[PDB]
Homo-oligomer: A and B are copies of this chain.
Amino acid sequence: ERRRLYPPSAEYPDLRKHNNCMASHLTPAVYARLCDKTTPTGWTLDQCIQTGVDNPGHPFIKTVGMVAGDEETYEVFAELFDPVIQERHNGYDPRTMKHTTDLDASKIRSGYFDERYVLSSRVRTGRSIRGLSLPPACTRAERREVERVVVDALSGLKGDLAGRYYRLSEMTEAEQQQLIDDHFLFDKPVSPLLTAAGMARDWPDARGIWHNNEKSFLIWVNEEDHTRVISMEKGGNMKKVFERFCRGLKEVERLIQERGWEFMWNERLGYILTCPSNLGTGLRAGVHIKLPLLSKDSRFPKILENLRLQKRGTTGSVFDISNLDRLGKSEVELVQLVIDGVNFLIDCERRLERGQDIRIPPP
């Protein structure tokens, strides 16, 4: 018409007191360029950066501040998304570098941990369906559809990979309590970032938990991403949980492809997930390890950072140790790196108990 739209800079957010990657990498020129662009489904830049805008963040804990709604979001708004990935994934370049996926689990070697040192071992990743929007942008119908696809695929599961599916909509109090006792049930998201991103709409509609009979295979349906798969065990046996995880993943992929649905996947980004931090693989191979003597030493965080491992709470000297680079390295490579780090910390703790000096690994 003849009326004038608001200038692109008139919609520019106030990012003076923000400390997330979105605010750091957002410039007036990029916002002006990407204000008009829109994904085929309907996701806009403002909806992409709403989580970063509403949450200023805090120093010493830097977040991404961005979410995605579709596969096209990483392409329509690629100009802003690429530097965020660059800074979040230690310099990984989506412009030219190509991600490699290796989920065979036939390359895992050794990696058996001491039972006293390691109490539990987990392998966790996420997946999303290609034809349906991401949790920030998915409507109620699409959230029902992803649940239906996952339930239909997981119904045809046999062998040790056998279990049931519980819907939070009609979850009874007794089974809810037993799931809480098993530390498998997920609550309504309360983090301000998730709520601002729109990952808690329509709760608990279309949200479900798929539980294996052996209590080793866990599936969360559209709580933070379309599917969150976990293979866990009480002990230090990473090879068995890794092979169970890969068998379940390939079985689910084959079943959904047989039904006609396909996982989100791109050559340059890997497995597409809603949060740009979890990209490529989404793997967090964690370990609940108790190393009091090593935790006493102040050089322990530096040594952990040298091998690209991070520590988090479960404290009683028991911590969860997980890898860093979700994107840019193969899944089996990530598993090998995390088991190597765990073994290095195990022998360091053995030396500390014996009093032997520990050599710092190269960064």
In whole Å, how far is A344's beta carbon from the nearest beta carbon of chain B?
A: 42
Within 8 A of B (CB), among A16-75: 16, 28-29, 31-32, 35-36, 38, 41-42, 44, 46, 50, 53-54
For residue A17, which residue of chain B has the nearest CB?
B169
User: Taking the complex as formed, is A187 at the interface, i.e. its CB lies under 8 A from any CB of chain B?
Assistant: no
- The reply to whether the CB of A201 lies closer than 8 angstroms to some CB of chain B is yes
Nearest chain B CB to A140's CB is how many angstroms away? 5
Copies of the chain in the assembly: 5
Chain B residue with Cβ nearest A142: B4
**A7, B184: Cα distance in complex, Å:** 31
Shortest distance between the CB of A261 and any CB in chain B (Å): 4
| Cβ of A174 under 8 Å from chain B | no
- In the complex, the answer to whether A132 meets B13 with C-beta atoms within 8 Å is no
Q: Give CA–CA (A144, B53) in the complex, Å.
A: 15
A32 to B257, CA, bound (A): 13
The answer to whether residues A261 and B9 also contact, given A4-B142, A32-B131, A35-B3 and a CB cut-off of 8 A, is yes
CB neighbours (8 Å) of A12 from chain B are: 140, 259-261
Asked if A312 is an interface residue, CB under 8 A from chain B, the answer is no
A359 lies within 8 A of chain B by Cβ = no
- Pick from B7, B38, B133, B202: contact of A2, CB below 8 A: B38
Which B residues are in CB contact (< 8 Å) with A262? Answer: 9, 28-29, 32
Bound: A221/B142 CA distance, A: 24
Tell me whether A11 and B140 are in contact (CB under 8 A).
yes
| B11 and A139 contacting across the interface, CB-CB below 8 Å | yes
Q: A145 to B10, Cβ gap below 8 A?
A: yes
Among A2, A4, A132: residue with most chain B CB under 10 A:
A4
Residues of B within 8 A of A196 (CB): 201
Q: Contacts A10-B141, A201-B54, A262-B28 given: A5-B2 contact, CB under 8 Å?
A: no
Select A13's contact among B2, B28, B140, beta carbons within 8 Å.
B140
| CA of A13 to CA of B169, assembled, Å | 12
Minimum CB–CB distance for A158 against chain B, Å: 14
Closest to A1 in B: B36
Can you spell out 20 A-B residue pairs with CB atoms less than 8 angstroms apart? A3-B6, A4-B133, A4-B142, A5-B6, A6-B139, A8-B131, A9-B261, A9-B262, A10-B131, A10-B140, A11-B139, A12-B261, A13-B140, A14-B169, A14-B259, A14-B260, A28-B260, A28-B262, A46-B140, A53-B201
Question: Across the two chains, which residue of chain B brings its CB closest to A10?
Answer: B141
Residue of B nearest to A2 (CB): B44
Of A28, A38, A133, A144, most B-chain CB atoms within 10 Å: A28
Question: Does residue A186 face the partner (Cβ distance < 8 Å to B)?
Answer: no
- Roughly how many angstroms separate A195 CA and B16 CA in the complex, as a whole number? 23
Q: Is A200 touching B54 in the complex (CB atoms < 8 A)? A: yes
The yes or no answer to A205 lying at the interface (CB within 8 A) is: yes
